[PDB]
Design an enzyme around this catalytic site. Structure first.
Site, PDB file in Angstrom:
ATOM      1  N   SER A 113     110.170  51.768  97.269  1.00 14.45           N
ATOM      2  CA  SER A 113     109.453  50.593  97.752  1.00 14.45           C
ATOM      3  C   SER A 113     110.237  49.705  98.738  1.00 14.45           C
ATOM      4  CB  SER A 113     108.876  49.731  96.627  1.00 14.45           C
ATOM      5  OG  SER A 113     108.351  50.482  95.559  1.00 14.45           O
ATOM      6  N   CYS A 148     101.610  48.855  91.268  1.00 11.72           N
ATOM      7  CA  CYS A 148     102.124  48.327  92.522  1.00 11.72           C
ATOM      8  C   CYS A 148     101.212  48.738  93.680  1.00 11.72           C
ATOM      9  CB  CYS A 148     103.691  48.617  92.636  1.00 11.72           C
ATOM     10  SG  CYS A 148     104.694  48.129  94.112  1.00 11.72           S
ATOM     11  N   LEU A 149     101.720  49.632  94.524  1.00  9.63           N
ATOM     12  CA  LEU A 149     100.973  50.123  95.658  1.00  9.63           C
ATOM     13  C   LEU A 149      99.697  50.759  95.118  1.00  9.63           C
ATOM     14  CD1 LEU A 149     101.155  50.293  98.880  1.00  9.63           C
ATOM     15  CD2 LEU A 149     101.484  52.691  98.410  1.00  9.63           C
ATOM     16  N   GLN A 159      97.406  48.349  94.389  1.00  6.82           N
ATOM     17  CA  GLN A 159      96.695  47.812  95.525  1.00  6.82           C
ATOM     18  C   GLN A 159      95.686  48.845  96.056  1.00  6.82           C
ATOM     19  OE1 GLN A 159     100.322  47.061  97.582  1.00  6.82           O
ATOM     20  NE2 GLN A 159     100.625  45.028  96.702  1.00  6.82           N
ATOM     21  N   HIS A 192     106.005  46.163  87.357  1.00  7.35           N
ATOM     22  CA  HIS A 192     106.470  47.489  87.061  1.00  7.35           C
ATOM     23  C   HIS A 192     106.666  47.822  85.599  1.00  7.35           C
ATOM     24  CE1 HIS A 192     107.631  48.846  91.345  1.00  7.35           C
ATOM     25  NE2 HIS A 192     107.425  47.553  91.553  1.00  7.35           N
ATOM     26  N   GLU A 214     107.434  50.584  84.201  1.00  6.50           N
ATOM     27  CA  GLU A 214     108.564  51.452  83.958  1.00  6.50           C
ATOM     28  C   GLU A 214     109.888  50.669  84.116  1.00  6.50           C
ATOM     29  OE1 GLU A 214     107.081  50.870  86.445  1.00  6.50           O
ATOM     30  OE2 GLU A 214     108.299  50.865  88.300  1.00  6.50           O
TER      31      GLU A 214
END
Ligand SMILES: NC(=O)CC[C@H](N)C(=O)O
Ligand SMILES: NC(=O)CC[C@H](N)C(=O)O
Ligand SMILES: [Cl-]
Ligand SMILES: [Cl-]
Ligand SMILES: [Cl-]
Ligand SMILES: [Cl-]
Ligand SMILES: [K+]
Ligand SMILES: [K+]
Ligand SMILES: [K+]
Lengths: 380, 358, 357, 379
Positions: free
Chosen positions: D46, D268-269, D272, D352, D354
């Protein structure tokens, strides 16, 4: 565990540790007996394409420094040693050896039986080999690379290291008190000399300038016509790597000068070409002369000088023309080391009068040249 | 850093163990561990300016003393660690004896080498670049002064010549991710300053007493808190300077501006330089501030309340005697005796029993 | 390495200066400084096996003693250097005290660290890759053995297990540029062995006395040389083992084969291993080789002349008394007394004056 | 002296010392508040095209180790720190920080006022910058280099970091006692998850496996139909660098899967993208969320979780489609952190789960995915 490996043509394996760049190295493996001057050894252009073996076990004890560089770069293809010291310990050091090695991207190997290797090359003669520095070096691969190497015989390496353009040189020799001096003003140095750059050592130049000579370094392939146009007070032929035979332009240019009364002086390869350009023939030594304890007699004066040597080729004295006298000879094997022209003002030495590294014993040889040159301007 | 008081307990075992023996503690804040640590040492109120030497290098027996203090920690081990590095011991050697992570030890060794450099180069050798690098590692002007053989004032002055002054950063719980409207600051040798002192207010600074010790307890801190509470209530902008993490005086709610810094002349001057207070109170924090009073006023500081001279008039044995006589009051017979023999006679004259001050 | 005899001169200033005080010297050859330096220490004949500790790791006063020894050097400074590293002193600190170049010092420090490792792991931690490492740095079996908590022989037995034996290189003045017909060798843990022992002649080995010291002088060497000369003249192939660089015994013309090595059980066994001599003379070199007698024999070496047992009967006080008595000869009255009180008594018995050993 | 210089688009200069490779680096400058996890951060894909600033002054105290690598490489364009400690001091260290940065050819600078940098980024927003580490760093040129950077807005970095071919992943989580475990044999793992590699962190994978999920890692542009062909028990949308908005192939594939009953979870991405697929809009944050102490509330259960965050764009809530319900929100700024499709087995989280580095607080998120998966197969 940072592995390295050395494999020779005969497929002789030498397992040690990596101390320089990662990757592979290929060339003619040679041994050098010098107990001092390894940086000078490594920065000598003459080492091009050859993998250098140092007989003296501890290498790097004094670290490195700039003043001790003979050329702009590390010409050795490789480096094989018995032991890299834990530290460098000398007031002149500026960088340890492993560091410097990496910086120059030199694959290097240490902790190997360098004696056994020396004995092999001695008995068996020059071998081609390869060093593979890495995580899991492949023997079979290095061996393959070792064998693939063309070899130095018949290989023009001088064209491979010469300058692209001609430069002026006016820098003198180093001193303990002053280090490397500031280049002089051409208005300072009395004689003008042309120096064919067959892969020249800074020391020659410096020693030359010391004598009051303004130098003009030219590329290896410069024409005589071109040089003669400079109105040289003298012409110098430099040291260099590879076979001197294959350098047609040189012999030519040289022959061309011989036709003339201008004083010629050659060193190492410069000496070979002078021979070649005189009718003589060159040969490739079984192992060659690499060290700084080499006894060379001056037949004329019956004197002995301890000299620095770096050659894998020599001139046959059986092939000498009656116009070329024999002035120096090796007391180790009888091999030829100096020749002079009966007719011309030309002379050349197989050893390294500028040493660096080594005994300053052969330095007076430059004295002859200057003599010649002074004479030339008297008569000319 | 904990504050001990073993000298008051002459017969006690002074080796550190699992049972607490300290009487207070100091805290410091720095942009790096070195700065943090040196600032704590200098505000510990033990007369230290950083890693002052405990042992001479010239003592054949030094390493024996050294090794002992490292192996069996006492209140002075921090200084002995540097002493060790100064006497050739290595980080692994010190670790082996102390068990302090090497992460910390190497920092202390680096600071010793830098000291050796100051010692060699002297003041002349203290260029701006070098001095700044030293200020950044937390070195005190006083320590640097001892090292280059000059007075503290000279190092400080040099810093002025070079416009070498610390900056103040603010505590904010979030590593600057969010804005703060609180003025809880620490000094650092960095680029940007967040002090942003006001210029519309009449400021009163109150100096605290550092870490607590026997005889210098919470009672002074209380007085400190009260000066701030009272004056702020009156409309003054209160600024507290102190570094004891246990007290009310170091709670951001207590004053308008809190400077969590060593209560030293150097540290306080730097605050005074940018705050330009209308007045500085040195009489409530105990011995610590009391001792800086004279040097503070002598440094241009607006010391308020009883003057440092009057304080000295009182603290001074003979000056006070005079006062008392002038006032025609009663005071126990006294005599200052340099040597023994004189003692016994002067003593005959004063009349036993007697109180012998060291 | 110089040889000193200060214990024989109790009232003397034992500090090293510009006036020589040493009585002899030892020499070693190794492929590396560390190997060479360690072979010398073990050839010194002072009872060292290398860098044996001089002071205790737990003595609180140790750093003080070490410091004094380094600053104002005595015959034992080399040993203190090591102790100084074990105690926490840095290379810089040792240099400041000694003025000995760091190039050397750092080498000794690394030897100390490696010793630390051995002590940690012990024997079980003596792999072959690591035993070789240790050998290559010049480590003596007897030194490792001490560190590892075992017997020298265990170390040696181990080395065999792993076919970890030294190779011998030759001296040639030229760094191998020219072959040699001379057999002037030194042991090393390298790849190629240049010993190339004969198989056609009857070999006899002569053990020298190492460095000279009071009581173990040139008289011994003279005998070793004579042993070599006469036996060679007679047709035996002579092998000399010695490391004193001052003598004729270590001159290459004195013998057919010269091994310039420490006169130790270890080094001698490695030679015997490869040479397989007809006989080994341990009686001409003084105390040094005499003391190796019994263990060389125990080890299978072909020791000639007077037997180690016969030597012990002479060398051992009681054994010899026993011998006198058997012969019905006369010796002065003696007695062995452990304690003072017992002495004064045995003493009244024996009769003064007395000779107390 | 080993000089280094940091220059921001606005012309602000930060003079330091080189601690990594010699050279130039350009990217978007961000600040991260994590007091631990610097190596994990560096190796997080990222961070592709960004120059990472760490607020905790001492960076490198524990050196580096291969197990703490969150990908195959160091994705950050550069590293900006306050102090590089003299040594690394941790039983797990295999290589000092400076050595490692060199190894990875990361231009890096130390010794600068990172607090001053942070305050500027916080106050004025993200800025592009350039690090020049070398003999005599040219400030005019670093400013030019900084200004020439096109910016992350509109930049698909996912396609840049994705895997070329698809691989299988069956390795679990590390343990102090165990370390990284050997990878598992497919049989040992009950579920097949197809995970889109948008620049995925090793840790997510591992956490899925731990949960008994065999994984098939597919390139970023893989088609929905090509995936469907794998008969996925579940589909996972990885985290990743740059703007999600321009990743049409993604959005697309996604919307397709969203016609199905196949359970889908993004992070995350991935989060999105799942929202864009559903029709929501994304925005570029002023400075973003980069840290390991970010409080996120579960609006449903009304509980707070401390999370690890790394994102510079976010889903606008006011543009939410009624099929997407808001499950999580940021307690620092009110920004959206979680969503669930009301009609499908599709949920996602902004932070996140993880972690790596950071608080394990959000880990329970994976459980809800696995629960949906089980459901799916149940039926
Ligand atoms: N330092 C101050 O004056 C604080 C100013 C402002 N509130 C900030 O946090 O940036
Ligand atoms: N080691 C020997 O037997 C000597 C062999 C040969 N003369 C050489 O020098 O290579
Ligand atoms: Cl080898
Ligand atoms: Cl300086
Ligand atoms: Cl091992
Ligand atoms: Cl800065
Ligand atoms: K080897
Ligand atoms: K300001
Ligand atoms: K700076």
């Amino acid at each position: 565990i940072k592995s390295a490996l050395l494999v020779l043509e005969d497929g002789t394996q030498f397992h040690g540790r990596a101390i320089g760049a990662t990757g592979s190295a290929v060339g003619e493996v040679v041994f050098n007996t010098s107990m001092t001057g390894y940086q000078e050894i490594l920065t000598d252009p003459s080492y091009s394409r050859q993998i250098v073996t140092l007989t003296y076990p501890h290498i790097g004890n004094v670290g490195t420094n700039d003043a001790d560089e003979e050329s702009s770069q590390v010409h050795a293809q490789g480096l094989v040693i018995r032991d890299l010291p834990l530290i460098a310990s000398n007031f002149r050091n500026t960088e340890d050896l492993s560091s410097y090695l990496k910086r120059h991207n030199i694959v290097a190997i240490a902790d190997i039986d360098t004696r056994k290797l020396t004995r092999l090359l001695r008995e068996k003669g020059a071998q081609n080999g390869c060093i593979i520095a890495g995580d899991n070096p492949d023997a079979a691969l290095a061996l393959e690379k070792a064998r693939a190497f063309p070899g130095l015989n018949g290989m023009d390496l001088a064209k491979e290291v010469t300058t692209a353009e001609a430069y002026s040189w006016t820098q003198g020799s180093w001193t303990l008190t002053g280090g490397l001096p500031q280049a002089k003003k051409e208005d300072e140095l009395p004689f003008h000399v042309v120096a064919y750059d067959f892969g020249a050592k800074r020391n020659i130049l410096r020693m030359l300038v010391d004598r009051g000579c303004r130098l003009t370094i030219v590329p290896a392939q410069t024409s005589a016509e071109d040089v003669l146009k400079m109105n040289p007070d003298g012409i110098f032929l430099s040291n260099g790597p590879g076979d001197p035979a294959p350098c047609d332009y040189a012999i030519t240019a040289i022959q061309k000068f011989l036709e003339t009364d201008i004083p010629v002086f050659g060193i190492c390869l410069g000496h070979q070409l002078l021979a070649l350009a005189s009718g003589a023939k060159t040969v490739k030594m079984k192992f060659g002369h690499h060290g700084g304890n080499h006894p060379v007699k001056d037949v004329e004066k019956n004197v002995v000088m301890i000299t620095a040597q770096n050659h894998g080729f020599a001139v046959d004295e059986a092939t000498l023309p009656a116009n070329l006298r024999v002035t120096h000879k090796s007391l180790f094997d009888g091999t030829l080391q100096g020749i002079h022209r009966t007719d011309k003002p030309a002379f050349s030495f197989q050893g390294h009068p500028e040493a660096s590294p080594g005994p300053h014993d052969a330095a007076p040889l430059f004295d002859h040249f200057i003599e010649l040159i002074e004479q030339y301007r008297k008569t000319a | 850093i904990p504050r001990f008081n073993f000298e008051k307990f002459a017969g006690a075992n002074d080796r550190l163990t699992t049972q607490m023996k300290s009487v207070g503690e100091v805290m410091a804040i720095g942009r790096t561990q070195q700065e943090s640590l040196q600032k704590a040492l200098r505000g510990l109120e033990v007369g230290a300016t950083g890693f002052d030497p405990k042992v001479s290098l010239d003592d054949p027996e030094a390493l024996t003393k050294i090794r002992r203090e490292l192996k069996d920690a006492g209140a002075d081990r921090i200084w002995y660690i540097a002493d060790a590095f100064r006497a050739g011991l290595s980080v692994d050697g010190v670790f082996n004896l102390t068990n302090i992570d090497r992460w910390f030890l190497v920092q202390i060794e680096e600071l010793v080498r830098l000291e050796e450099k100051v010692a060699e180069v002297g003041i002349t050798g203290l260029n701006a670049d070098f001095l700044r690098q030293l200020k950044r590692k937390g070195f005190a002007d006083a320590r640097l002064a001892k090292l280059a053989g000059v007075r503290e004032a000279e190092i400080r002055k040099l810093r002025d010549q070079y416009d070498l002054h610390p900056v103040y950063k603010r505590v904010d719980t979030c590593a600057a991710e969010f804005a703060t409207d609180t003025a809880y600051m620490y000094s650092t040798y960095e680029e940007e300053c967040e002090a942003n002192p006001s210029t519309d207010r009449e400021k009163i600074m109150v100096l605290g007493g550092g870490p607590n010790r026997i005889g210098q307890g919470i009672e002074f801190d209380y007085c400190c808190v009260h000066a701030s509470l009272a004056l702020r209530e009156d409309g003054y902008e209160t600024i507290m300077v102190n570094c004891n993490p246990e007290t009310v005086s170091t709670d951001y709610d207590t004053s308008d501006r809190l400077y969590f810094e060593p209560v030293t002349l150097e540290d306080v001057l730097e605050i005074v330089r940018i705050e330009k207070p209308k007045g500085v109170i040195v009489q409530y924090g105990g011995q610590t501030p009391l001792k800086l009073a004279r040097a503070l006023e002598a440094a241009g500081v607006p010391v308020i309340g009883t003057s440092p001279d009057a304080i000295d008039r009182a603290e001074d044995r003979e000056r006070f005697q005079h006062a008392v006589e002038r006032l025609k009051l009663k005071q126990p017979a006294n005599a200052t005796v340099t040597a023994i023999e004189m003692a016994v006679e002067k003593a005959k004259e004063i009349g036993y029993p007697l109180v012998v001050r060291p």
